[PDB]
Amino acid sequence: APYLEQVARTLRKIGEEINEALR
Amino acid sequence: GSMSEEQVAQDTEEVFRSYVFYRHQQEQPADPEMVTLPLQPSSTMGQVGRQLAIIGDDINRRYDSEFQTMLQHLQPTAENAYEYFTKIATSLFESGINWGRVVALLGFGYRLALHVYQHGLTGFLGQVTRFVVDFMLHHSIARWIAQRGGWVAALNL
C-alpha cells in the first residue's frame, strides 16, 4: 500500500524531469 | 492512417529491451537475458531505447537512493510483481499521458526487473517486458504513441 503510491509519486517526479530533458 | 497499436506494441518491446541493456551498462549483476533483444540493437527502435537510457542517466542517478529504499520495503518478487507493477503504473498515468511519463515507465520496468533478479533471485525480464507492453496497449498509451508517429517522436520534442 503506502510504498506503492510513493513509488508512483517518485515516477511522476522523474517523469516531469524527463519531459524537461526531452524538450 | 497512423501506424497500428499492434506495431507500437512490437516497437515498445524493442525500445524497452534496448533501454534496459544500455541503462545497465551506463550504470556500471546483470540478468543474462538482458543481452537478448528482439531485433538487432542498431535498429531504429534499438537506437531510440539507447538514446532514452542516455538522456535519463543523470535524472535516474539522482533518485537511486530513494528508489532503492522504496523497493527494499516493497520486496517485489515474481509472486507480487504484476500487482505492484499494475498499481504503480496506473497511478503514474492517472492524470494523463506525456512523454516523460512514458519514458519513466521504462525506467520503472528496468528497476523492477533488476530488483527481482538481484534480490529475488529470479530472472523476470521477459515478464516485465510483457507488463510494460500490455499496460501501454490497454491504457491508450500505444495509441497515443502511434498517433504521434511512434517512439521516434520522443527524441524530437
Could you write out the DSSP letters of every residue in chain B? -PPPHHHHHHHHHHHHHHHHHHHHHHH----GGGG--SS-TTSHHHHHHHHHHHHHHHHHHHTHHHHHHHHHHH---TTTHHHHHHHHHHHHTTT---HHHHHHHHHHHHHHHHHHHHTT----HHHHHHHHHHHHHHTTHHHHHHTTTSGGGGG--
Q: Residue B4, CB half-sphere, CA atoms under 13 Å: how many?
A: 4
- A18 to chain B, minimum CA–CA distance in Å? 5
Query: B101, B155, B157: best mutation site toward chain A, by most A Cβ within 10 Å?
Result: B101
Residue contacts between A and B (CB atoms, under 8 Å): 76
How far is residue B52's CA from residue B156's CA, in Å, rounded to a whole number?
12
Domain limits at B44?
Answer: 5-155
Distance CA A18, CA B41 (A): 23
CATH number of the domain enclosing B52: 1.10.437.10
Task: Measure the CA–CA gap between B25 and B19, rounded to whole angstroms.
Answer: 10
Cα angle B55, B118, B66 (rounded to 5 degrees) comes to 55
Q: How many domains does chain B have?
A: 1
C-alpha cell at B157: 520534442
Are the C-beta atoms of B45 and B157 separated by less than 8 Å?
no
Residue with cell 521477459: B126
DSSP state of A1: -
Pick B91's closest partner by Cβ from A8, A13, A21. A8
- B125 residue type, one letter: L
CB nearest to B88's CB, from A11, A14, A16: A11
User: What gap in Å lies between CA B10 and CA B146, rounded to an integer?
Assistant: 12
Q: Is B108 on the interface with A (CB under 8 A)?
A: yes
Q: Does B78 touch chain A (CB under 8 A)?
A: no
Q: Which residues of B26-47 are buried (b: 16+ CB within 10 A; e: fewer)?
A: eeeebbebbeebbeebeeebbb
List all residues 6 or more positions away from A3 whose beta carbon is below 8 Å from its beta carbon.
Answer: B70, B73, B74
State this model's resolution in angstroms: 1.3
Which set of grid coordinates corresponds to residue B107?
525506467
Expt. technique: X-ray
